[PDB]
Design a protein around this ligand. Structure first.
Ligand SMILES: Nc1ncnc2c1ncn2[C@@H]1O[C@H](COP(=O)(O)OP(=O)(O)O)[C@@H](O)[C@H]1O
Ligand SMILES: Nc1ncnc2c1ncn2[C@@H]1O[C@H](COP(=O)(O)OP(=O)(O)O)[C@@H](O)[C@H]1O
Ligand SMILES: Nc1ncnc2c1ncn2[C@@H]1O[C@H](COP(=O)(O)OP(=O)(O)O)[C@@H](O)[C@H]1O
Ligand SMILES: [Zn+2]
Ligand SMILES: [Zn+2]
Lengths: 125, 408, 528, 341
């Protein structure tokens, strides 16, 4: 309601918006960092899809990212297609030992994972 | 380097070399044998390049597995209807448009038999489409005759799919695909066929071996000469329609329709209305346009309907998914269509154009069917004025029998 | 006479029983729970199965599930005699296992013959269902020559008489008497699911599949629902393969036709604050929180509806409110109150309104797009179609039944016939469909928020007249629309210069579109 | 062989009517006829053995009930409790005030609902003459006057109620349908909405907007309480004793108070003649009328909104019934049933 009746501040109101302005950059980076943590944690419940029912290796990343979505993530917390690409692209980076994907002519192709202890490497987060 | 299981051989190299063409004529009646030899050759070539050349060491999966080879640009034959009973089982090359796809149909490759009295299991594989039932259990002790039983869901199967193609010889032919070639061809795909013409005791079909999903430098010199000359636009108008005199802007108009804009994802399907007097050669144009342009469809608004333009869609018992009978408008997908008598088109049919000229799609939701299509095309429209002649004493928007939503 | 032993199966069952005795013993508490409540089927989470031997136990169980099933059945039903023998009693040893919570959710688009015999989970919209029936899970026979009895006569996917009389003193074969009391039967149901609308690209067509349900998992499938199944793929003989091209194998003559089907053992349907909150991690919680606990979120989200469309800031509020429909209430008297919101939009043929419908149908969790002239009464509400496996009719989900608990979109509303505009009326307010046509008398849930677009009667807005005369929509339909917008265009230079500036940018080229669905999946819970 | 179907008021929300098959043997035949409601005791057995094992995947059967005895009833605690309320002075205004209490006003309409639920006496005068007993009601008026939600209340209150919608109902689907027997291959008839509602009520919404032919078949039911059919060699008449409550809209969607009713609607004198009570509704504007109605509705959404646990919460529900109704609703349903019997 009409709560802001008497905030009779001095000329510090200019300094008031410095706090609004000068600190907003760090919070935006933190929100960016949270999404990275948001993505870097979802991959834990993603590689179980790969480990469970795919052992042949004709799959390109376009098909798999279209199956990261419309999948177990199609739940109380859906995920985006471009995020799914970021999810699948992060797997090689976080696990270089078992995944080595290279550009073929256009796009990426995904091969049969060698696989290990599926989630012990999450300590890198 | 590739983790693939096959190679799409650049078969145009066969006509680019002398001895290969001689092989082609020899291979015209025996394509299977060489491909089977090439499979072992590919594995041997892999093994020789990996470990014999000592350039690699990952060989285990390749050595055990099986490969294939697919020539894709072999010289075309004399067309479909020109083939002969002896041309059956010969390698051919054809082209066409895919219309419909059947669902995944598995076929037997390995049969799993278990002895019903002693649980012994045998692995039986089919050769040349023959199932051989074991007569007795192979164990030394258990030898009961006819004891072997078949378990349906312990066998091994391979994908078999029937894809329907509208073939234009160098009529529609029902193609066939197997293994990884299934579901690689989907409705509306532009297709060139490299396979085997087949008719067996007799229906005409092609066992597709490979499928293709799709001039001189002197011509480039010829193009640049017209491209460089200053009378380019003047020459084009002077040369496009010899029968039609002058009409510089009309020459520029329809020509820009054929050039079209750029397509981004926003299409360049330019559409034109000829509001001319009902005696100026405009049918003489659009009849001529239908021929000169890359092959489209000639339609009349008076003689067309919403079903006639769009489609008739129904279910199929065998395929268990929707099938389409393409109308006039859909058949012009990606090309140019001419709609004469546009002023005489039925109101229900005219309602279709609204979504066509805004999204190039058509959405249908009727009894048992709910789906959307795509009909990206260019429209050339000619319309006589209201009455026997144009009446400039009335506003132009009143001389045209089209609503503002459609006229805009 | 010793029969062949499956050493891999014995290893699996030994690992199976060891897993049962060690998992913490919540599953044994469930076993005791079944004995207390007289239950038939035990349920096991796949991720619980996949956290032993680094999940390698699940992998062997998964890819060859149909083979290894009896070993797990023996593995458990030995344990039940170890700790709950009363479940073996009758007034006999019926026992079932139903897995769930698979990581992968394959589409009807993605059926391959390689998947036959493996464990997989799929999701598809239901179109028809069958009535429940008993299935002869295990039978027993008594001899005809002598009067010996044969028990545990399993019927694996076919009728199968015993192949011999066990006593050598008798020679009976292919002549048996079927017991109907010592024998056992189990529930059975067929579900005809359909590929989801969001799976099939434009121009492509939806695939169809038939799914089998057995056990207590039956009847948890209702038409129009987005169900989710878990089970294994199994092929069954087919009769429509005749006449196809290509060489067909033969048995020797006997035929060997097949068609693909999927067998499901578990059923669940995709959809109270604290129930929802605990299902998300802190990072998920914080990400969803940043869209709720910010002082300007209602201002922000309006500007995040169809960002390509310029202006029309009122419709961006209206649709956003329609996307968060109000609280459904039931009277203490028994009457129910609507919670969903209907919206209509009218503008000149230049004002982009179809773009809003395209955005809604491309963004909403469940949504259907249709056109005025193309649609019809039966296609919108309900389809009376003759059903298979019987001579009686069965409903087929119309446009409104699809995307139930969602948003339904209709374009060019003024072009619709009055006689087939009438059929939407009951669904707009009572959120139900009433049918009395040829032996069908049910009332169907139709909780849908109708969104419509239309143009004035004169094409352009006749600005000489008033709002009363430019619309052909009668009083009843106008009253039902909670919001009603008429947007107009003028020759204001300051607006057209900006309008032309950015529409060209389309051809030149706050919260993300994925964020809005995450927010809405939380907001829909509050009931002020 | 006789088919039993769930009672019309007992079908769970959003499902087709579940139904089974019953086997009548040994002089148990002809105990019931279409439209009758019966209770039967029998043996639950399976007998469908045949091509079902192969024509459908895997061996399955179907279930039947072999009927042993069948019956087509009040304790003292009920009747003795009724007579306490019965002796209350001026009971008529108590019942009327309890007709859908969460709707403000419309008392001269609620009385029509109250009178139709109790019905009259179906006087079969001297046998040779017959007169219908149930009261027919037509609700007509402007949108936003709860002409439909009342019909969503009569369904939940009357013993047997069948609900229908104008354009969603067909002539065959209301009166009767034609089928072929799956066992004897003979022409058989199946009852419709009116046949189901025998000794009950039929509720039609948007009565005007349906096509003329669908509206035409109603004529016989509203006076004869029967369905007469002649199709595919079937010549018979069924029992359709049910009151009809119909909601409609005037021509143009608004009621023209300056014109007669016969001119305000697309119907005609015949169709209007079969009705007993017509409830014309005007949505006229007035601040005092609006303040009373709005302050009632705004409180209705306060209470209908959510917020020995069984006993404690059941106490809360009847507490709110006392807030708005002089009669507990469960008793009133029984009280109507007792009065009708
Ligand atoms: N400018 C022109 N150039 C060539 N032919 C013309 C011209 N104007 C009229 N004609 C002739 O007049 C006849 C009328 O044909 P056209 O105008 O194309 O269609 P319509 O008969 O419907 O008016 C044609 O045969 C055409 O040859
Ligand atoms: N505010 C806007 N932002 C972006 N594009 C617009 C806007 N207004 C109009 N347009 C463009 O103008 C066209 C208007 O067509 P539309 O009004 O959707 O036709 P219809 O009446 O058939 O729905 C659209 O294709 C759209 O691209
Ligand atoms: N007299 C009233 N008292 C309380 N609520 C009412 C009244 N009249 C109308 N309403 C409200 O308006 C809505 C009318 O719905 P409906 O019965 O479909 O209207 P119609 O009369 O057009 O059939 C109901 O949801 C109801 O809550
Ligand atoms: Zn043996
Ligand atoms: Zn015997």
């Amino acid at each position: 309601m009409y709560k802001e009746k008497m905030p009779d501040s001095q000329a510090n109101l200019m300094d008031r918006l410095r706090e609004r302005e000068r600190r907003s950059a760090a919070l935006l980076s933190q929100r960016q960092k949270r999404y990275q943590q948001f993505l870097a944690m979802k991959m834990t419940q993603v590689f179980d899809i790969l480990f469970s029912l795919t052992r042949g290796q004709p799959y390109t990343e376009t098909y798999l990212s279209s199956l990261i979505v419309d999948s177990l993530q199609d739940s109380n917390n859906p995920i985006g297609t471009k995020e799914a690409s970021e999810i699948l692209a992060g797997l090689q980076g976080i696990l270089p030992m078992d995944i080595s994907v290279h550009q073929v002519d256009g796009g990426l192709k995904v091969y049969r994972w060698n696989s290990l202890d599926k989630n012990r490497f999450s300590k890198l987060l | 380097e590739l983790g693939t299981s096959n190679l799409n051989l650049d078969a145009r190299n066969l006509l680019a070399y002398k001895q290969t063409e001689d092989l082609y004529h020899q291979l015209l009646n025996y394509p299977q044998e060489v491909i089977s030899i090439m499979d072992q050759t590919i594995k041997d070539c892999m093994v020789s390049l990996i470990v014999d050349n000592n350039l690699d060491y990952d060989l285990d999966e390749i050595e055990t597995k099986f490969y294939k080879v697919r020539p894709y640009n072999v010289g075309s034959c004399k067309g479909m209807r020109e083939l002969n009973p002896n041309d059956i089982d010969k390698l051919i090359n054809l082209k066409g448009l895919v219309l419909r796809s059947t669902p995944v149909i598995p076929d037997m490759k390995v049969a799993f038999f278990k002895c019903n009295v002693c649980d012994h299991t045998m692995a039986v594989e089919i050769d040349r489409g023959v199932i051989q039932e074991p007569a007795r259990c192979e164990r030394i002790d258990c030898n009961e005759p006819n004891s072997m039983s078949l378990i349906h869901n312990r066998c091994s199967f391979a994908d078999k799919q029937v894809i329907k193609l509208q073939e234009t010889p160098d009529h529609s032919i029902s193609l066939c695909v197997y293994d990884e070639l299934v579901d690689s061809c989907r409705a509306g795909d532009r297709i060139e066929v490299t396979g085997t013409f087949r008719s067996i005791p007799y229906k005409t079909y092609v066992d597709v071996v490979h499928v293709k999903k799709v001039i001189t430098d002197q011509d480039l010199a010829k193009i640049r000469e017209v491209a460089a000359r200053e009378d380019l636009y003047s020459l084009l108008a002077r040369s496009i329609a010899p029968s039609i005199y002058e009409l510089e802007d009309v020459k520029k108009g329809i020509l820009l329709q054929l050039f079209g804009g750029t397509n981004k994802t926003y299409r360049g399907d330019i559409n034109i209305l000829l509001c001319g007097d009902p005696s100026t050669s405009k049918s003489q144009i659009l009849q001529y346009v239908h021929k000169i342009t890359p092959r489209g469809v000639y339609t009349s608004g008076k003689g067309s309907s919403a079903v006639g333009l769009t489609a008739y869609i129904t279910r199929d018992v065998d395929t268990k998914q929707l099938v389409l009978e393409s109308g006039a408008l859909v058949l012009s997908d990606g090309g140019v269509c001419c709609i004469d008598e546009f002023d005489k088109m039925s109101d229900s049919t005219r309602s279709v154009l609204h979504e066509v000229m805004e999204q190039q799609t058509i959405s249908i939701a009727k009894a048992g069917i709910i789906t959307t299509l795509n009909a990206r095309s260019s429209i050339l429209a000619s319309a006589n004025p209201i009455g026997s002649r144009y009446n400039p004493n009335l506003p132009v928007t009143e001389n045209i029998d089209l609503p503002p939503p459609l006229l805009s | 006479v010793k029969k062949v032993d499956d050493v891999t199966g014995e290893k699996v069952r030994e690992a199976f029983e060891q897993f049962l005795e060690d998992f913490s013993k919540v599953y044994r508490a469930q076993i005791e729970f079944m004995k207390i409540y007289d239950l038939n089927t035990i349920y096991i989470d796949y991720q619980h199965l996949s956290m032993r031997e680094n999940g390698a136990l699940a992998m062997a169980i998964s890819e060859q599930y149909y083979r290894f099933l009896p070993f797990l059945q023996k593995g458990l039903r030995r344990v039940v005699r170890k700790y709950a023998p009363e479940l073996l009693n009758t007034s006999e040893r019926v026992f079932q296992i139903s897995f769930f919570n698979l990581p992968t959710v394959h589409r009807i688009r993605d059926i391959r013959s390689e998947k036959i015999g493996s464990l997989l989970s799929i999701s598809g919209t239901v179109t028809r269902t069958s009535e429940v029936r008993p299935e002869l899970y295990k039978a027993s026979f008594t001899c005809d020559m002598c009067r010996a009895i044969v028990d545990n006569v399993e019927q694996s996917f076919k009728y199968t008489e015993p192949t011999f009389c066990p006593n050598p003193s008798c020679e009976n074969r292919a002549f048996w008497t079927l017991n109907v009391t010592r024998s056992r039967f189990l529930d059975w149901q067929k579900v005809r699911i359909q590929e989801n609308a969001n799976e099939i690209p434009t121009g492509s067509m939806p695939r169809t599949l038939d799914v089998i349900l057995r056990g207590d998992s039956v009847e948890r499938a209702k038409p129009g629902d987005r169900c989710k199944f878990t089970g294994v793929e199994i092929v069954v003989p087919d009769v429509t393969q005749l006449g196809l091209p290509g060489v067909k194998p033969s048995s020797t003559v006997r035929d060997l036709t097949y068609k693909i089907s999927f067998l499901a053992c578990h059923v669940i349907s995709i959809g109270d604050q604290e129930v929802f909150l605990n299902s998300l991690s802190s990072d998920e919680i914080n990400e969803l929180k940043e869209m709720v606990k910010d002082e300007h979120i209602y201002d922000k989200l309006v500007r995040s509806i169809a960002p390509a469309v310029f202006g029309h800031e009122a419709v961006k509020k209206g649709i956003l409110l329609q996307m968060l429909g109000g609280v459904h209430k039931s009277t203490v008297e028994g009457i129910k109150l609507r919670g969903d919101i209907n919206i209509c939009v009218v503008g000149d043929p230049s004002t982009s309104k179809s773009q809003f419908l395209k955005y809604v149908v491309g963004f909403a969790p469940r949504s259907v797009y249709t056109s005025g002239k193309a649609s019809s009464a039966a296609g919108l509400t309900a389809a009376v179609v003759r059903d298979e496996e019987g001579g009686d009719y069965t409903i087929e989900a119309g446009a409104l039944m699809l995307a139930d608990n969602g948003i339904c979109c209709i374009d060019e509303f003024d072009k619709m016939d009055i006689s087939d505009q009438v059929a939407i009326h009951e669904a707009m307010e009572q959120q139900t469909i009433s049918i009395a046509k040829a032996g069908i008398h049910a009332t169907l849930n139709a909780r849908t928020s109708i969104l419509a677009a239309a143009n004035p009667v004169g094409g352009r807005y006749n600005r000489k007249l008033s709002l009363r005369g430019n619309l052909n929509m009668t009083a009843p339909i106008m009253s039902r629309f909670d919001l009603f917008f008429v947007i107009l265009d003028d020759c204001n230079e300051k607006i057209d210069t900006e309008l032309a500036s950015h529409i060209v940018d389309l051809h030149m080229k706050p919260f993300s579109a994925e964020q809005l669905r995450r927010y809405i999946k939380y907001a829909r819970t509050f009931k002020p | 062989r006789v088919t039993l179907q769930e009672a019309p008021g007992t079908v769970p929300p959003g499902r087709l009517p579940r139904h089974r098959e019953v086997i009548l043997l040994a002089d148990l035949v002809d105990v019931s006829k279409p439209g009758e409601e019966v209770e039967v005791t029998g043996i639950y057995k399976n007998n469908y053995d045949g091509n079902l094992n192969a024509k459908n995947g895997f061996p399955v059967f179907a279930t039947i009930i072999e009927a042993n005895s069948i019956k087509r009833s009040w304790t003292e605690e009920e009747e003795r409790e009724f007579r306490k309320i019965s002796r209350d002075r001026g009971i008529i205004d108590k019942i009327i005030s309890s007709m859908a209490p969460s709707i403000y006003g419309h008392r001269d309409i609620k009385t029509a609902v109250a009178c139709s639920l109790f019905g009259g006496v179906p006087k079969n005068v001297n046998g040779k003459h017959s007169i219908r007993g149930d009261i027919n009601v037509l609700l007509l008026g402007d949108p936003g006057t709860a002409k439909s939600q009342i019909l969503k209340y009569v369904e939940k209150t009357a013993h047997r109620a069948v609900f229908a919608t104008g354009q969603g109902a067909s002539a065959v689907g209301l009166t009767a349908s034609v089928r072929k027997d799956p066992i004897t291959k003979e022409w058989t008839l199946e009852g419709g909405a009116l046949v189901l509602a025998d000794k009950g009520v039929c509720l039609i919404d948007e009565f005007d907007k349906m096509n003329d032919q669908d509206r035409t078949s109603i004529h016989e039911a509203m006076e004869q309480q029967s369905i007469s059919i002649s199709k595919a060699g079937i010549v018979t008449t069924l029992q359709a004793r049910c009151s009809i409550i119909a909601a409609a809209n005037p021509n143009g969607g608004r009621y023209n108070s300056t014109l007669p009713l016969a001119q305000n609607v697309s119907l005609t004198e015949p169709i209007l003649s079969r009705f007993d009570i017509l409830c014309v509704v005007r949505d006229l504007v007035d601040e005092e009328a609006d303040e009373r109605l709005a302050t009632f509705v705004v409180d209705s959404h306060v209470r209908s909104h959510p917020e020995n646990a069984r006993q404690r919460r059941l106490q809360r529900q009847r507490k709110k019934e006392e807030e708005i109704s002089p009669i507990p609703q469960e008793l009133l349903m029984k009280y109507i049933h007792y009065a009708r019997t």
